[PDB]
Amino acid sequence: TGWKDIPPVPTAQEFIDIVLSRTQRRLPTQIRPGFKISRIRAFYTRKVKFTQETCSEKFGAIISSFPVLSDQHPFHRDLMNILYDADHFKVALGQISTAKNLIETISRDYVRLLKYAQSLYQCKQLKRAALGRMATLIKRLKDPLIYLDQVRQHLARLPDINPTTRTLLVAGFPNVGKSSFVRSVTRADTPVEPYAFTTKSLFVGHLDYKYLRYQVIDTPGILDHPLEEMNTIEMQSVTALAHLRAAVLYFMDISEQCGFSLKAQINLFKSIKPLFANKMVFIVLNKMDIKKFEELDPEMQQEINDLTKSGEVEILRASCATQEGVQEVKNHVCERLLVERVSQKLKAGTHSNGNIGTRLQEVMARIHVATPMDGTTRETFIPEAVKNLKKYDKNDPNRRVLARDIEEANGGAGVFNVDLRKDWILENPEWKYDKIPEIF
Amino acid sequence: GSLAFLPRKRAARHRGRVKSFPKDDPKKPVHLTAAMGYKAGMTTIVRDLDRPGAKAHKKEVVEAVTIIDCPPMVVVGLVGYIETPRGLRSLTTVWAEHLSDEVKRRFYKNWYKSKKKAFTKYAKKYAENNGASITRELERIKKYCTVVRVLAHTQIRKTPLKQKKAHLMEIQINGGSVADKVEFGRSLFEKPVTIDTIFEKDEMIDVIAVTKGHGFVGVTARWGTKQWTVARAGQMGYHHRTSVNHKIYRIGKGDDEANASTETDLTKKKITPMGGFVRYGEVNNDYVMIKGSVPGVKKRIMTLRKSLFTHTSRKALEKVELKWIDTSSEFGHGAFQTAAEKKQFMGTLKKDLQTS
Amino acid sequence: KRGAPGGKLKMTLGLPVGAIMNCADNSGARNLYIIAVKGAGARLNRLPAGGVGDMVMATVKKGKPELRKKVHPAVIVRQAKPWKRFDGVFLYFEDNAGVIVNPKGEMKGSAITGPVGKEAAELWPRIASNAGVVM
Amino acid sequence: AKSARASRIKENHQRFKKNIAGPVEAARLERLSAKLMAIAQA
Amino acid sequence: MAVRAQFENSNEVGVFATLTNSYCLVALGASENFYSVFEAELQDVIPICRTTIAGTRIIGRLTAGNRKGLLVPTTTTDQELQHLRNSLPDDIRIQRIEERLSALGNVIVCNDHTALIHPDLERETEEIIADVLGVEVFRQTIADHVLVGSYMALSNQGGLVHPKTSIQDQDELSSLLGVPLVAGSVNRGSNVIGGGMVVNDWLAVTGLDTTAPELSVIESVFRLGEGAGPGAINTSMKNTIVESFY
Amino acid sequence: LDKWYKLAKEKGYRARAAFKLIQLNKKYGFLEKAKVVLDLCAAPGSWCQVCAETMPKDSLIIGVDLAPIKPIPKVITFQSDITTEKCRATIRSHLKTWKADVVLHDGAPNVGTAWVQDSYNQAELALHSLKLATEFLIEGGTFVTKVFRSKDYNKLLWVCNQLFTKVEATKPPSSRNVSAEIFVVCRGFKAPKRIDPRLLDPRSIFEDLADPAPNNEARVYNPEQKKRKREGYEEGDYTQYKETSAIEFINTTDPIAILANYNKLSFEQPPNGDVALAALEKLPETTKEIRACCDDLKVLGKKDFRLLLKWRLRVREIFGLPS
Amino acid sequence: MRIENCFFCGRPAWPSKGITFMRNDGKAFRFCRSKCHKNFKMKRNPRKLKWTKAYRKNAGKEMVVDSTLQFAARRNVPVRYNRELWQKTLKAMERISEIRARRERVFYKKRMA
Amino acid sequence: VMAPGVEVEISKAQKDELILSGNSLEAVSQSAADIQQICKVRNKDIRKFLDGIYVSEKGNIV
RNA sequence: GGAAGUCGGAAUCCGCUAAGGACUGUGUAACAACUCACCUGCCGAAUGUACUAGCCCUGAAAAUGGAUGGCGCUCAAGCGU
RNA sequence: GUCCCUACUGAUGAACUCGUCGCAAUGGUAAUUCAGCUUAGUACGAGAGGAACCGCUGAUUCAGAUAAUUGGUUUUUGCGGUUGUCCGACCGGGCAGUGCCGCGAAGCUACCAUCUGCUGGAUAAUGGCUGAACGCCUCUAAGUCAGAAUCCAUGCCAG
Ligand SMILES: Nc1nc2c(ncn2[C@@H]2O[C@H](COP(=O)(O)OP(=O)(O)OP(=O)(O)O)[C@@H](O)[C@H]2O)c(=O)[nH]1
Ligand SMILES: [Zn+2]
């Protein structure tokens, strides 16, 4: 559902100030040398204990808010491994846990020391030593606390990707038109500017098709590296292409305004093909306004048709600056994703057991249409007024009365007094607004 | 308890004073600001509510209302006041001729054996030279005073009380120059003023009286528990209270003979309950129907005055429509509103057949 | 959003904390034991009390073991305490009964045995649609 | 919540007094002064 | 034509409204956002009435009727009965019945030609229903639910039935009724169809949080004047139904 | 303070639960001759310690417990829970083929939720302990369970009586007498061919019994009384209404039962048509008072119910029924 | 509004007068006073108490059959509002009520003959 | 309400502009500052909600 | 991946000079653009850095209402001679 | 093995001839929190979700009253029933420290019932205008605008 509910984590100096002001202001501070030594010990035992549970509640809040990578869907696990260097993430969280236990150990030791103290002065120095030792332990946490604040703000600004839902993945080279297709279909704000790496991260959009919700993921864009060495940016698109279940839309630019050769674009598609070993792959031939399919070299037609000769790969055409091809490439892909997911859902339930599943029975109860056996339709009463009636539109300047606008002119929700006699139908119109007798 | 009502002592006077009249501006029309009446009792009504935003909107609500009997006050005087660094000072009181014996009973503690000589020489200065002493004292009010008040008294013979001593009270005139309100006060002498003219229907008013006395009680009931702040025993009740924002639901005439009749129930009946108000009697005059509870016991004089400020609620701008008014017996579980429909329901009785 | 009722007029509270009231739905529970009243304040030594149309935290004492495993919200639908409505009618029911609901105001059961108080049906539309008798 | 003596609560009440409740009370005072003028002049 | 609406922040349209082929009943309260969304769909074609029944807001669960009659329980006062009589034309028969099951909208389902009643309704109520509504009366349960009005919605063109109704129960109910019947949900998976949506022969008003697939089956079962959905769309857009409600 | 807990803190053990187990062992000796011990809820350093002393040392001591207690040395202690099937298979892999000779369970739920939620959660955990005990026990084995006094304890006593041979409610010394902390022991495991599913099911065990006959004599012979219905309503029977013909009231053998339970005696003609109904209407008896009482049975008193019973005896004298 | 009649004794129950008891089967009982309600809860029969109107009808102390008592009834089919009908209805009940009283008086003289 | 001596006119020269002019710099600048302080967003994000009325040019009429 | 003084690591030179850092900040995806250091022109004669000494403010306070003894005192009715 | 003065809460009161109407120094002081409708499925948002000002209506706590209605209370010993005993029986009554039971007005009561709770000025944190110190600059120095449930008052209690 997101990770924006993580409370902010302060630096080392603010953590000391928060903890120490909390002890000063929420507990009494006046003690006297003339009091009993048991009262003197109890005053300083309370100060040391209070500082400990204040520290333990903020340390526990940081640990129990950041995501555990083990209890995660494995798309998100390599994403935050790429984004945050997951080895450093568990080291920084380990240093919070170690400092939490060391503060508890100091409080346990110095409460015992306060038990055997004899004077107010000795109780005062033991309180100060425990508080200063806790303060030096937080001061050593300065580097982990800066790191944990940067990841939290990045995690709060991370898009919500549902890996199990219907998904359209747009991948390809830089400057082919990956981001312009997303804005054309979804109303997601993805930067479109003509330089190499504009899309720095993963952008998500949503569309509606056949009264169903879909996801469109915009990726940064990958180069022709052999995947052993890549960018942090490029690998983020790689783990999106591998650990999600989508319909990959590979974008190729026939015209050479992308800054890369057609031979390089074909070769990347062949190299990253094993990442798409399960899902369907569609090739979208983009920027058709510049160069069409037919003025290309017939040798280059043979290779991309041999790409089509591979089993599940299909080649479609579009133009993201005229919008005359981007509409049906949305309809074609989303329809093919609709059929496969239904067929997978029907198979899970019609498995080889001889019995139809329980959860496939309910949908078949839902989809079934019950009709009368006689076939005689019941006769329908619809007046002739509505068959010529005009649809109400709020932007039309010639609308009807629409009593909510009577309310707005005459007051509001709590001021306007409705009249009920105006809808009364009587033999004489003067007989409304009458005081009808009731008791005689 | 509240520390605002801290001197929990008995009220200094039975009538109870206004203590604050509304702030006056000269641009308003001339009007009086307070009145007096006598508490009769309470009844039950049904009001057709018009409260937009309420769950009882355009529905029937049953509410408790209080009846205050209001015979017409008679104006007998005029008192002028001047501004001072020490406060406000009374400069001149001008009475009228032909003062009634009722208000004359007020200036005596033993009326039955006195010679009744009050205001006898004051009746002679109205015809001494031509009335020079009277006109001089009014011109002193016109040219020196900053606000003027009216002395008015109620009549006890119109009310069913064994008392005969009238209640005399000062009522402030607001809205005009000091010259204009003086010519009101002299013209209003010897004249009855009805509650139809002072107040109006659908108006929050301010009710001032002395509460029910309970004598010496302990801290269980005086404070409400399980120096001044320490709960100590003493007098509970007979305290002066000023209540705020009570709606006038009806102003009966007393002549109309269909006071409890509404536009929806066509029964010609009056406000007096069937058998009479318990421990009060019959209301034969103008009456004011006040929504809700109101301080003071039955038979006690009630002081009504105008609200000090302009209201900030839609409850004050609400037109009140009554469906029916209860007139059944206060003396028991009365199921009959008028005498006529009790004999219609019961049928012929033995005493009715023997008499006829 | 808490399950405090919105726009309910003042009426005489009849069921305090620690009262056994009947379960009127067909979820399987037989009685409900009130342990907390939703929306009711607590100043000092005052037992919170509920009326018709007030959801409370209840525990099933007798009934189906599955429903006995957890604490449940429950809206009171009947009350033997005589209370007053704005139409002047003082009224009371034969017993105290309620129905188990979720925090959103939707009841687990499908039908309500006996009548439903008018204030409970007017405030909770799901109880109003499963009420056979509304009075 | 807001106090009864809050500055913005007072400013809302002053807008109610001037614009809504003002002309209502001025109209009812014209009728009542007219009836008092009738009695005093008679 | 099916539109979404809300009486308040509540999505239960059928609880607060009653829609027939000649009149519409709307609960009276606060603003007229609920009223205007009905007026914007009925441009003074059939009369509309702001009504209270028994001093409560839940009008759709206490009354039941078709274009020939209107029925109200015994708790309605004479003022609400007269307000209903003056508002509606004389072609509507208004009757107040002394049935102990006072929630008539929960226990009676009716269209112009048939009626489903509660099994333990009285004989004097059943004969009055046939007389006033002018329809034939049957006693049935909708998937072992005796409050038929809450869990089943019906017009002369089709009906929407509780989702967990068995296929065998759908065939015998549709044959007895003469209209196509499809099980489905309203208001994001709620089983209370009658309390969630109101339907007549040419339009339907449902809750706001009903889903896009759920609004498609309301368009399909209840036909339109445009003739887009005749009820056979379900076997054509089965793929949407399969993925959405699996 | 507790004298047995103070004895443990001085010299004895970690807690007073070990004193509870030696009291059960003193009451009945089973730890002396057994070989395999399995504790479904290991008490911290107390129950495993007395298991280490009396039994042969280091002989299949399974210490599964959901609470992360300190691991007792020479006792195979697991910090995982017991209800999951994966933990059951983990138990299976650790015992190889040696099933447990004695099974022990400590029922310690979150007590405090009005003593009814806590009693069921204790009873549900006790039935879950019985499921694993019935899965793994030798013919003639011993089972030790902690239970709370309730109506579920009566059902738990019955299911141990049906499945085992020797049943004993211990209630020993060193036990908390303030609460309902009661030990039970089951011996004589019958070794059935198949474990019955609905016998171990918590729904069938904790299903409420059939309701007894309501005091119809109290509702008829003195209906001005009290004891209002604090329990709920029966399955079905909604709308709270019941009516039959007056002939079925006459023809029945229990006139008190029909009068108390039912709302109205009807004189409406059945569609087939009863000549007994038409004869009963046309009698010189049942005039006015009987017809008024038959319309509203729920508002009647002693004299009205008595007059109905004398009326049906007179019609049976007319009609010829034996009594 | 409507003047209700007491279930126990039949005197007119006006608004805010008495109490109303609702039973689990759907039936409401309106009472005019506490005396009527308390006698109902202890399950006494109003046909036997001599102050109730059920006894008087059962014992023949007021007559039930005649044309004027048939003319008043509870109406469940509303009529359209008509000012001429409502004014002429009011003159009818003035005539109806005085005809009843002059027939009530003859009925009482016949019993006392 | 403006100070006595400052006149406010709607600019029929550019979009969404008012002119506060007068003889007293104290009166003109204070009345301009009153408009800014009365249109100020509360309990929102300053970096995103940029709505308001702001002083653009200060100078002389002549 | 991109890194042009300004995400980083290390060096930090020369010319033209009146002077201008292989750059002090703003800014760009990188540039661009602005700005600082430094320099020249105009106005004008005294400035400005660090300390020291007095007087004054802060340099920590709980809990019935109260104390330069009180009123009160400000080119003193306070401080130094 | 160490019923009295005063304080407080109430009530009277001599002298000013008795009263009637008043003024107000001084002392006290009071309201509090939540929800719902509209704004609005709006601004904002990829989605999931999701406000606020103005306006309207209720509720919790506190405070001050009140008894039309509902419930409770019964020495109304008001009416009726009934146990023991007695006045010879009937009628009418007595005793059982008010025998018992039912209803029971009036009165007292109950957030177990109902009603009512009000507006000006000056400030603190802070945001500004003009403008020196200091030829830039500056909310402060002289001058000055706004702003908290705060402060002082009015409303309210005593006199
Ligand atoms: N003529 C033409 N130009 C296009 C078309 N689509 C995109 N472009 C241009 O080509 C550039 C493609 O860059 P983007 O739109 O950002 O797509 P991208 O492949 O994700 O590029 P990056 O975001 O930088 O990775 C854009 O700047 C457009 O100006 C097209 O359909 N026709
Ligand atoms: Zn009665």
Closest D-chain CA to B75:
D40
CB G76 within 8 A of CB E97: yes
Rg (CA), chain D: 17
CA dist list (Å): F219 to C95, D1, F228, F253, G13 = 17, 55, 11, 18, 31
Beta-carbon separation of C62 and F238 below 8 A: no
Q: How far apart are CA F245 and CA A183, in angstroms?
A: 76
B115 is written with which tokens?
């010679």
Beta-carbon separation of F224 and G43 below 8 A: yes
**Amino acid letter, residue G57:** K
CB C120 within 8 A of CB C52: yes
Q: How far apart are CA E35 and CA E50, in angstroms?
A: 8
B139 is written with which tokens?
């011109």
Q: How far apart are CA F15 and CA F20, in angstroms?
A: 10
Beta-carbon separation of B324 and A437 below 8 A: no
CB B174 within 8 A of CB B24: yes
With tokens 């099951």, the residue in question is: E101
Does B232 lie at the interface with E, CB-CB under 8 angstroms? Answer: no
Q: How far apart are CA E10 and CA E3, in angstroms?
A: 15
CA dist list (Å): E111 to B135, B303, C47 = 89, 65, 51
Q: How far apart are CA E143 and CA E161, in angstroms?
A: 9
Cα angle for residues A119, A121, A123 (degrees, 5° grid): 75
Please state the separation of Cα A284 from the chain's center in Å.
27
Q: How far apart are CA G49 and CA G62, in angstroms?
A: 16
C130 is written with which tokens?
């499963």
Cα angle for residues B80, B85, B91 (degrees, 5° grid): 20
| Ligand 1 pocket check for A47: Cβ under 6 Å | no
Q: How far apart are CA E217 and CA B82, in angstroms?
A: 84
F97 is written with which tokens?
């083929």
Residues in chain H: 62
In the sheet with E198-199, reading across from the earlier edge strand, the strands are E2-4, E204-206, E198-199
Which helix (H) or strand (E) segment holds residue F289: the answer is helix F289-295
A45 is written with which tokens?
């035992």
Ligand nearest to the CA of G39: 2
Q: How far apart are CA B42 and CA B55, in angstroms?
A: 26
Closest CA to F146 of F106, F174, F186, F187: F106
Q: How many Å from the CA of A367 to C1' of J60? A: 51
CB B320 within 8 A of CB B202: yes
Q: Which residues contact F317 (CB under 8 A, 6 or more apart)?
A: none
**Amino acid letter, residue E109:** V
Strands A167-172 and A212-218: parallel
**Amino acid letter, residue A71:** D
Q: How far apart are CA A307 and CA B3, in angstroms?
A: 93
Q: How far apart are CA B46 and CA B321, in angstroms?
A: 9
Burial class (CB within 10 angstroms; exposed 0-12, middle 13-18, buried 19+) of F70: exposed
Give the closest-approach CA distance of F140 to chain E in angstroms: 49
Q: How far apart are CA B213 and CA B222, in angstroms?
A: 12
A304 is written with which tokens?
């991309």
Q: How far apart are CA E160 and CA E217, in angstroms?
A: 9
**Helices and strands in chain C: count of H runs, count of E runs:** 2, 9
Q: Which residues contact B101 (CB under 8 A, 6 or more apart)?
A: B116
Q: How far apart are CA A110 and CA A116, in angstroms?
A: 10
Residues of B with Cβ-Cβ distance to A438 under 8 angstroms? 264-265, 323
Q: How far apart are CA B77 and CA B152, in angstroms?
A: 7
F108 CB neighbour count, 10 Å cutoff: 15
Bridge partners of C49, per DSSP, are C16
Give the CA diameter of chain E: 53
Burial class (CB within 10 angstroms; exposed 0-12, middle 13-18, buried 19+) of E226: exposed
B282: left (phi over 0), alpha (psi -120 to 50) or beta: beta
CA dist list (Å): B35 to A182, A438, B205 = 79, 36, 11
Q: Which nucleotide is nearest to A158 (CA to C1')?
A: J46
CA trace torsion F210, F212, F214, F216 (10° rounding): 120
Strands (E), chain G: 4-5, 12-13, 19-22, 28-30
SS (H, E, C) chain E: CEEECCCCCCCCCCCCEEECCCCEEEECCCCCHHHHHHHCCCCCCCCEEEECECCECCCCCCCEEECCEEEECCCCCHHHHHHHHHHCCCCCEEEECCCCCCCHHHHEEECCCEEEECCCCCHHHHHHHHHHCCCEEEECCCCCCCCHHHHEEECCCCEEECCCCCHHHHHHHHHHHCCCEEECCECCCECCCCCCCEECCCCEEECCCCCHHHHHHHHHHCCCCCCCCCCCCCCCCHHHHHHHCC
* Active-site position among F146, F151, F242, F310: F146
| Ligand 1 pocket check for A325: Cβ under 6 Å | no
Q: How far apart are CA F222 and CA G49, in angstroms?
A: 20
Closest CA to C107 of C97, C115, C98: C98
Beta-carbon separation of C88 and B56 below 8 A: no
SS (H, E, C) F87-124: HHHHHHHHHCCCCCCEEECCCCCCCCCCCCHHHHHHHH
Q: How far apart are CA A127 and CA A385, in angstroms?
A: 88
CA trace torsion A243, A247, A249, A250 (10° rounding): 50
Closest CA to B222 of B238, B295, B214: B214
Does E241 lie at the interface with A, CB-CB under 8 angstroms? Answer: yes
Q: How far apart are CA E151 and CA E107, in angstroms?
A: 10
G110 is written with which tokens?
């016949």
Residue A236, SS3 per DSSP:
helix
Q: How far apart are CA B138 and CA B135, in angstroms?
A: 5
Ligand nearest to the CA of G30: 2
Half-sphere exposure of F289 (CA within 13 A, CB side): 16
Q: How far apart are CA B178 and CA B175, in angstroms?
A: 9
A350 CB neighbour count, 10 Å cutoff: 12
CB B287 within 8 A of CB B70: yes
Residues in chain D: 42
Burial class (CB within 10 angstroms; exposed 0-12, middle 13-18, buried 19+) of E156: buried
CB C31 within 8 A of CB C60: yes
Q: For chain H, how far is it from start to end, CA to CA, in angstroms?
A: 26
Query: Which experimental approach was used here?
Result: cryo-EM
Which helix (H) or strand (E) segment holds residue G76: the answer is none
Residue C77, SS3 per DSSP:
strand
CB B257 within 8 A of CB B283: no
- Sign, CA torsion F209/F211/F213/F214: positive
B53 CB neighbour count, 10 Å cutoff: 15
CB F156 within 8 A of CB F150: no
Q: How many Å from the CA of B210 to C1' of J108? A: 19
**Helices and strands in chain H: count of H runs, count of E runs:** 1, 2
Please state the separation of Cα B109 from the chain's center in Å.
24
Closest CA to E154 of E97, E112, E208, E205: E112
B63 assigned ligand-binding residue:
no
Closest CA to A168 of A126, A136, A213, A106: A213
CA A195 to centroid of ligand 1, rounded, Å: 9
B178 CB neighbour count, 10 Å cutoff: 17
Residue B140, SS3 per DSSP:
helix
Bridge partners of B147, per DSSP, are B81
A71 is written with which tokens?
């209890």
B189 is written with which tokens?
């002498």
Closest Cβ opposite residue A440 in set B53, B266, B323: B266
Q: Which residues contact B204 (CB under 8 A, 6 or more apart)?
A: B244, B245, B246, B247, B248, B307, B311, B315, B316
Q: How far apart are CA F308 and CA A342, in angstroms?
A: 69
A42 CB neighbour count, 10 Å cutoff: 14
Closest Cβ opposite residue G22 in set C87, C88, C135: C135
Does residue E8 lie within 7 Å of nucleic acid chain J, judged by its CB?
Answer: yes
Give the CA diameter of chain H: 42
Q: Which residues contact A134 (CB under 8 A, 6 or more apart)?
A: A19, A51, A52, A55, A103, A106, A107
Ligand nearest to the CA of A290: 1
Rg (CA), chain H: 13
Chain A span 5-64 residues with beta carbon within 7 Å of strand I: 24, 28-30
CA dist list (Å): H35 to A274, B36, G103 = 65, 52, 85
CA A98 to centroid of ligand 2, rounded, Å: 81
Residue A54, SS3 per DSSP:
helix
Q: How far apart are CA F69 and CA B263, in angstroms?
A: 82
Phi and psi (nearest 5°) for B88?
-130, 135
Q: How far apart are CA A302 and CA A308, in angstroms?
A: 10
- Do H and F make contact, counting contact as 3+ CB pairs within 8 angstroms? no
Query: Concatenated DSSP letters for D2-35?
Result: --TT-HHHHHHHHHHIIIIIHHHHHHHHHHHHHH
Phi and psi (nearest 5°) for F54?
-75, -40
In the sheet with E93-96, reading across from the earlier edge strand, the strands are E64-66, E69-72, E93-96
Half-sphere exposure of A55 (CA within 13 A, CB side): 32
Closest CA to G45 of F311, F302, F264, F312: F302
- Do C and E make contact, counting contact as 3+ CB pairs within 8 angstroms? yes
Closest Cβ opposite residue A437 in set G3, G80, G86: G86
| Ligand 1 pocket check for A192: Cβ under 6 Å | yes
Q: How many Å from the CA of A41 to C1' of J94? A: 82
A112 CB neighbour count, 10 Å cutoff: 10
Residue B152, SS3 per DSSP:
strand
Q: Which residues contact E60 (CB under 8 A, 6 or more apart)?
A: E13, E14, E15, E16, E17, E18, E25, E27, E105, E195, E198
CA A282 to centroid of ligand 1, rounded, Å: 19
Please state the separation of Cα E109 from the chain's center in Å.
7
CB B268 within 8 A of CB B41: no
Closest CA to F133 of F185, F180, F183, F181: F185
- B/e letters for A292-317, b = 16+ CB within 10 Å, e = fewer, are eeeeeeeeeeeebeebeeeeebebee
Q: How far apart are CA G86 and CA C107, in angstroms?
A: 48
Is F146 among the catalytic positions?
yes
Does residue A192 lie within 7 Å of nucleic acid chain I, judged by its CB?
Answer: no
Q: How far apart are CA F248 and CA F269, in angstroms?
A: 13
**Amino acid letter, residue G50:** K
Which helix (H) or strand (E) segment holds residue A45: the answer is helix A37-63
CA dist list (Å): H10 to H13, H21, H59 = 9, 12, 17
With tokens 């006395």, the residue in question is: B213
Which helix (H) or strand (E) segment holds residue A315: the answer is strand A313-317
CA dist list (Å): A100 to A104, A150, E202 = 6, 21, 68
Beta-carbon separation of E28 and B57 below 8 A: yes
**Amino acid letter, residue C82:** P
Cα angle for residues H7, H13, H18 (degrees, 5° grid): 35
User: In terms of DSSP H, where are the helices of chain B?
Assistant: 101-104, 132-144, 178-187, 195-198, 219-222, 340-346, 350-355
| Ligand 1 pocket check for A221: Cβ under 6 Å | yes
CB F247 within 8 A of CB F315: no
Cα angle for residues B156, B161, B166 (degrees, 5° grid): 30
Q: How far apart are CA E111 and CA E21, in angstroms?
A: 9
Protein residues placing their CB within 5 Å of the ion ligand 2: G 6, 8-9, 32, 36
**Amino acid letter, residue F247:** I
DSSP state of A274: G
